[PDB]
Amino acid sequence: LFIQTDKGIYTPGSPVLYRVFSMDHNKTVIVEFQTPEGILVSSNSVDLNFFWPYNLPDLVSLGTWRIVAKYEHSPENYTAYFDVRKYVLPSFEVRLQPSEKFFYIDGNENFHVSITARYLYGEEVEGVAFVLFGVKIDDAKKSIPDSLTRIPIIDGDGKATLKRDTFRSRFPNLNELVGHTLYASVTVMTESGSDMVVTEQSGIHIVASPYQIHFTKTPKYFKPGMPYELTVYVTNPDGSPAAHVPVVSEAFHSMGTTLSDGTAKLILNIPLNAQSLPITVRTNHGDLPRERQATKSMTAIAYQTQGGSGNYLHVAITSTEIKPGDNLPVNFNVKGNANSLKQIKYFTYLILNKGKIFKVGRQPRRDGQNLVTMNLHITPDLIPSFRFVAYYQVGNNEIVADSVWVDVKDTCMGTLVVKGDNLIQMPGAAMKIKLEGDPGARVGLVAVDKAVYVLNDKYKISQAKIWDTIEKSDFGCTAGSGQNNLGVFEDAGLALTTSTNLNTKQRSAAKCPQ
Amino acid sequence: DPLIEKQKLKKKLKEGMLSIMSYRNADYSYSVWKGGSASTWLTAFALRV
Amino acid sequence: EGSSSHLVTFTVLPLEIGLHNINFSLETWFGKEILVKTLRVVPEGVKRE
Amino acid sequence: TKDLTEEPNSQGISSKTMSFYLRDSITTWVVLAVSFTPTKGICVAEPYEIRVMKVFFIDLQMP
Amino acid sequence: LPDSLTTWEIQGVGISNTGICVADTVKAKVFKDVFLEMNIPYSVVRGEQ
Amino acid sequence: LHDIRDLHRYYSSESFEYSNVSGKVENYNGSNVVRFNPKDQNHQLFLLGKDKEQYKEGLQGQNVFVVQELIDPNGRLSTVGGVTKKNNKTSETNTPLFVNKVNGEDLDASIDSFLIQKEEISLKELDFKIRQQLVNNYGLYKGTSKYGKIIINLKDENKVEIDLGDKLQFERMGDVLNSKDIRGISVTINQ
Amino acid sequence: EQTYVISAPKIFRVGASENIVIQVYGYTEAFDATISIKSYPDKKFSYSSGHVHLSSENKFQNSAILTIQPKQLPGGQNPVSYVYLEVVSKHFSKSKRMPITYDNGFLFIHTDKPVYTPDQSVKVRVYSLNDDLKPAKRETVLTFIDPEGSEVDMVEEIDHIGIISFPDFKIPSNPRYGMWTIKAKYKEDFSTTGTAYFEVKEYVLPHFSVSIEPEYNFIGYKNFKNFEITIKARYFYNKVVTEADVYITFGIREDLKDDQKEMMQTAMQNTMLINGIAQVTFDSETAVKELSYYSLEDLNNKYLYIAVTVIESTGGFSEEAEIPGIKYVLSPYKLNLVATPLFLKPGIPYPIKVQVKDSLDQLVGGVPVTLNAQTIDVNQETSDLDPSKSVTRVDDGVASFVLNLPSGVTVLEFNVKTDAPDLPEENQAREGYRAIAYSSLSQSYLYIDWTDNHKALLVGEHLNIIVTPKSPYIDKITHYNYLILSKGKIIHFGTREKFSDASYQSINIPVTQNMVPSSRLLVYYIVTGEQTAELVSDSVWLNIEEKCGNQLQVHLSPDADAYSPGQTVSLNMATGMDSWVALAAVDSAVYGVQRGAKKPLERVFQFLEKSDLGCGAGGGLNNANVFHLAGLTFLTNANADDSQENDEPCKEILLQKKIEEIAAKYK
Ligand SMILES: *[C@@H]1O[C@H](CO)[C@@H](O[C@@H]2O[C@H](CO)[C@@H](O)[C@H](O)[C@H]2NC(C)=O)[C@H](O)[C@H]1NC(C)=O
Ligand SMILES: *[C@@H]1O[C@H](CO)[C@@H](O)[C@H](O)[C@H]1NC(C)=O
C-alpha cells in the first residue's frame, strides 16, 4: 500500500482527502484515522476505486495525525502522516544551503548557511532574518545562544554564519557531541513586517569523516586465481550516496571513483594459493587531508568447490547504473579441472526478484570457451534490484554456481508526465495541460499551492520511498556468492534439492541472521 | 595613428572596388545595369577606374 | 483574441515642420512597453541653390 | 481521477489533453499526478509547476 | 540586450594552453506574450492629417 | 627532513614568486640571512648555495622563487635560495618529461610536459613544481608512493638527480639552470 | 629468442612533437639505444636523436620524442615525402623509411553567421591549433572567394594567442549573390587547411510569409499513397492572410542543386488558402506514373519536388514558395554498425551493435532487429546460426547482440534487418557485413574488453580492463604490454606480468587529460618459439568525456527563459586559470534559413578528430593491421610490421494547349 493526501498540512475545519494505491499483484482495504493524541476516529472499508475525505471538525485535536492503511487480516500496516494545525501559509518560500554536508566535530571550519527567499509567486523577497544555531541531542535541542544573529536578506540573498569559537565555548566537552547533528534555526521576515516564515537546516552531521565506506554490496566470497570484483559504496554521513568520491586500496594499488549512486567497482587480481582476502578501503579525495577521509576493512573467504574439485564459477556483470530496456551483457567465466570443463555443456541461470523466481534460462557453451557471454535485456520487472544466480553441472554429480546482485535504476515501470507550456498564467484563467502516460492508466491528479508542498517534504509519497519499500522484500542476503555451491543458493534466497540428496540449509524465516 | 588610417583607407578602397564586380560578365566585360548586355562604354569606364 | 491580433489607430496631424519623436506605450496584464518612434515632417516642393 | 483511454502513438504513450480554470490565487501552483496501471503498476509523476501572477496586486497577510 | 524580438543563441569559446574549449551554448529568447508595432511612414507633410 | 605525510604538505604548499627585490646581507649565524617587504609583511631569505659564496654581498633586483619552508607569526617566513637573474626573460618553454611508475614487476608510465616559465630558473623552483605536478597528477606522497628519483637532462653527459624520499636539502637551492638547456625530465616513482 | 618493440605513429608531422616508444622482451644487462630520424634515403642528415636507456629499473621499456623543425626549401615549394626512423642498440639496429606530412594542426574559421545580405559585414575570426592541440603562434592567411572561382580578397594576420581576429569583410553595395568560400592556410612551412562557407543572398521584402510544410521530410511506403501537405501564409508576425488562391505543382528530381526536374501533368489545383492555412494531399503512386514512366518506388530513391504559389485574392498579390526535395526511401529505417569491428577472435564471444537511424538521420528508440548469419570453417564447412533478435535501446538506436563463436571458424558472414510489426517484408531495412579471423600461425590470439556501455568515462576515473588471451597453443605468457594512443600520438605505455596460472586477468589503467577527446588502447604479448618471435595484440577505441581541460562556462544575470527586450543583463564567465574567451551572439533563426548542415562550433571536436590516424573499433586483422589500424607503425618485431600500402578513407562511428507549346519551344 501507499497513501497520498491532497496536502501535508491542514486548517482545522478543512476536509482531508486521500487516495490509496496498491502495487497490484477480492480487493478489500481497511483505512484508519488516528489523531496524534493517539485516538481512533475512523475505520473504513474501501474498495480501491472510490473514497471520501475525513472532515476535520472546526474544533479538533492538533498535531500530526496518522492515516494508516492495511489489508483485512494481513499486517501490512502501511502508514502516512499529515499535519493539522492553526496556521497561515505564508506567501513566500525560504531555501537554505549549508556550506558543507557535515561538521568536523574537532576541526576549525566555521559553519556558513546561505539563505535564499522568494515569494511563492517567483520574485525576490526583501527583509530581515534571525538565525540561531544549536545541536540536537536526539530528541532534545541545545541552543548556542550567542550564535543567534540578525542578517539582512537583500534581493533575496544572505549568509548566516556560525563561529567555531562560539561553538567550542558552548561545547568544550567534545565527548558529548559524538554522533549528533548541528541544526540551524532560521526565521526570515519580510521587511514590511507583514509576513514571516521559519525553517530549519537540520541533519547536518557532526563527525570526523566527510564520507562513509560500506561493503555489504560486495560479496564475502571469491574465486581464487580469479579476478574478484569489489564493490565499494560511499554514503555521506546521513545515508545518501555521495558520488565522485575516489576510493583506493593500496594493498592492491587499485583505485576508483564512486558514481551517481554511490558505487565503485574496483577489480582485484588474486593469486592462486589464496584463501583469505583482506581488503582495506580508504576514501582518497584530493581535497580532504588523509587523516580526515574515512577508512573501512573487511576480509572475504574463498569459495569451496564441491569435493575440492577445483571447479570454480564466476559470473561477472560488466555494466553500471542500469536502465530498464537496457542491453547489459553478462560474462560467464569458468575455471579448473581440465577434463572437467571439457564436459561443461550448458550454463543454467535464474533471475530472482521481488523475492520470487522470475525468468530462468540456459546459455550454451561450446568447447574451448572458458569465457562465454550473453546479452541480457533488462525489463521494468527487474526494478529496483534483481539477482543473477547461475550454475553448471559436471557429469550429473557436481553442481557449482555463483550469484551477483544488481541495482536497476529505481524508476517508473511505465511513463507519466504532465505536459504544459510553462508560461506565466493569470488568475482564474483558462488552462490546458496534456497528460502523457501508460494506456488505460488511472491518473489521480492534485493541484497544490507551492506553500503546502514545501512546508511538508517528509510526508509526500515518492517513487523513491516506493521502490525502497518493495526492494525490502527480496529474500536475498549478500551481494552474492556463498561459502560454497550450496551457500550461493542459500544466501541468494533460493532453496535446493537434488536427486543426490544434496540440499540447502533449512530456511528459518524471512530476515537474515546478522 | 598614420600607418593605421592608411590601412583603414586602403580597406575602404578595396571594399568599394568590389562593388562593381557584380556587373562584370561572363567574358570579362561589364554591363550597364545588372543583367543587361554589356556596354563598350561602361567597360571602358571600369577600366578607367 | 487568443493567439491572434488586434489593431490600433491614432488619427493625428503635425504642424511643426519636421517635429519628431513619439513615445508610444502599451500596458498589458504583464507589464508596460514603451516603444519609441520618430515622426518625419516636411514642406511642399524642394530645391537648393 | 482522469482515465487515459485513448489509442497510443508509435511510442506506446497515450496523450490526454485537459481543460480547466485556474484559481484566483496569485501564487505558484504545483500539479502532482499519480498513475496506476494493471501491468506497470504505480508511477509517481513529474511535478508540473504552473505559475500565476499579475503586474499589480494586493497581498493580504491576514491572521 | 537589443530591443528586438528574436531568440538569441549565445555561444562563447576559450582557447588556452590546455586546449580549445567550446563552452555551453546559452539561449536567451526575448519576450513574447503580447506586443505592439507601429507603421510610421517615412515622410509626412505639415497640414496633412 | 623525512617522513611521508610531511612530504605531501611541504610540496602541496602555496608557491609564490617575486622580482625587483634588492637586499643587503647580514649573517644571523653561519654565513647569511636577508629580508624583504613583500607588500604585506617582512620576509626572510637564507642564501647558502654554492652561489651564495658569490653572493655574500646582497641582492640586486633579482627574481626569487619564495616558498615558505617555515613561518613566524607575522606573515614573514624563511625560504631557502630560489634566486634567479632578472631581467629574467619571460620566455615560456614546453619541456618533455617522462614519468614511470614501478611496482615490483609492473610498469605504468607516461610521456608528458613541464612548463618552464623563465629564462633562468632556480633549481629550488624546479624541485618544487616538478613535484607539485607529480603530487596531483601522479599520486606522489599518497600511500606507498614516496620513493623515486628525478633525472633532468642538460647536455650529452650532464644530469641533475633528486631523491624524492626527502626533499632535496637547502644548500643546493641557490643553484640555477638555463631554461634552453633542459633536454628534458625523467621521473620514476617506485612502490 | 627475444626481440625488442619500437613503436611510433604511422606517419610523422613536420614541426610536430612526435612520440616514440620502445619495449624489449630481452635480457637483463641494462643497455642503451639511439633513436634517430634521418633523411629519406641519404642517411647523412640527422634531424633529431634521443638516447633512451632502458634497463631493469625501467622494465626495459622507454621512450623519447623527436621532431623535424622546418629544414627544406622556403622559396620553392616541393616537400619531401618519406624519411628514415632508426634504432641503434648495443644488441640490434634497424630502420624504417616512412612518410611525413606538412599537414600540421587545424584552422577553424568562425564566421559570425552563415547568411548575409548586401552591405552587411562578415565578421570573421579564426581559431588556430597545432597537432599537439595547443595555441600555435603562427602567421595565418585567409583568402575569400566568390561563388564563381575568383580570389577576391586575401589577408594575413599574425597570431599571439590562438584566436586571430580578422578585418571584417563587408559584402558589396550590390554583391555577386551565392555561395561564398573562405579559405584558411598558414603562411609558413606547413600546409594545413581550414575552410568555411557563407551564403550571400538578396533580401526581398515580400508581402506574405509563405510557409510550406509536408508530413515528414521524406516519403516511405507509409504515406506513398497519400502525402500530407500543410501550406500557410501570414504577414507581420502573427496576423495571417485570409483569402488566397493556392497553386501547387510537383515533380520528381534526381537530387538537390541539380537545377532540373521532371514535372508531372497533374499540378494539384487550388485548395485555396483559407485563413492563414490551406491543406492538400498528394498520391505519390498515382502521380509518379505516366509522365515520369516510373511505376514502383523501387525505381525511386530520389526527391519529390514541390512548388507553390499563393495569391491573396483580396488586394491582388502573389508570393511563391517551395521545397526543392523530399527524398524517396524504400524504408523508414536505415542502419549501420557501431563500435564493432569486423575482426573476430575464435572461442570468444563476438559482440555486435547496430544503430537504426530514421531517414531523418536520427536515433530511433524501440525498433525490432533481426540477426542472421553463416559461419565458414577453416575446414571450409558452412554453418547457419539460428537467428537472434533484439530491440533497439530507448536512446542509442543501439540494438546489441552477442554470439559465442565455435573455435573452428575464420569468416563470419551476417545479416541485420528490421522488424516493425506493420512494415512490409520488402520495405524493412537490411544490411550485410562479413568479419574475418585474426590470422596467426601462432594460432594464439588476444582480446580485451572492459565494463562499460553508455560509456561516460570521466577523466580521473580508473578504467578496469579485462584482458583474455585465448587460443594460444601456449598461454606461456611472460608479460602483457600496452600502448595508449590519443590524438595521433602516444601518451601512455607499459607492462604487467601475467598471472602465471590463470586465464583472463585485469589491468587498471587510469584515464587522463592527454587522452581526453577519445583514446586508442592496444595490448600485445610475446609468444616465442625457436623460430624466434611471435607478437600478438588487439586494440579498442575509447570515448572519454569532452572535458575542456581548462573548463569554460558562461551564464546570464537572470537565468529566466524569456527576456524582455533591451533589459540590461549580465554575462558571467567561469574558466580554468586565466583562459582566453571569444564570445559570440547569433540569431538562432539564421540557421533555419539554410537547411545546410550545422555550422555552429559543435562541429569542432568531430573535425578535430580527424587528428587520429585511427580507423574503427581497433582490432586489426593480424598483429600488423591492429597497429596500423590504430595509427601506429613499429620497427622491431622480429615478427615484422607491415608497411601498409596506402590510406583508404574509412569511417569510424560514435491546361494543355499551353504546356505543349512553351515546353516544346523551350528549345
Ligand atoms: C502496526 O501498527 C501498530 C501501531 O498502531 C504497531 O504497534 C505495536 O504493535 C505490537 C504488536 O502487538 C504491540 O505489541 C505494541 O503494543 C505496539 N507498539 C509499538 C511499539 O509500536 C504494530 O506492531 C504494527 N503491527 C506489527 C507488524 O506488529
Ligand atoms: C520617452 O521615454 C524615454 C525612455 O523610455 C525618456 O528618456 C524620454 O524622456 C520620453 N520621451 C517622450 C516624448 O515623452
UniProtKB/TrEMBL annotation, chain F:
GO cellular component labels: extracellular region
Annotated ranges, domain Staphylococcal superantigen-like OB-fold: 6-87
Every Staphylococcal/Streptococcal toxin beta-grasp domain range: 101-188
UniProt family annotation: Belongs to the staphylococcal/streptococcal toxin family.
Full protein name: Superantigen-like protein 7
Lineage: Bacteria, Bacillati, Bacillota, Bacilli, Bacillales
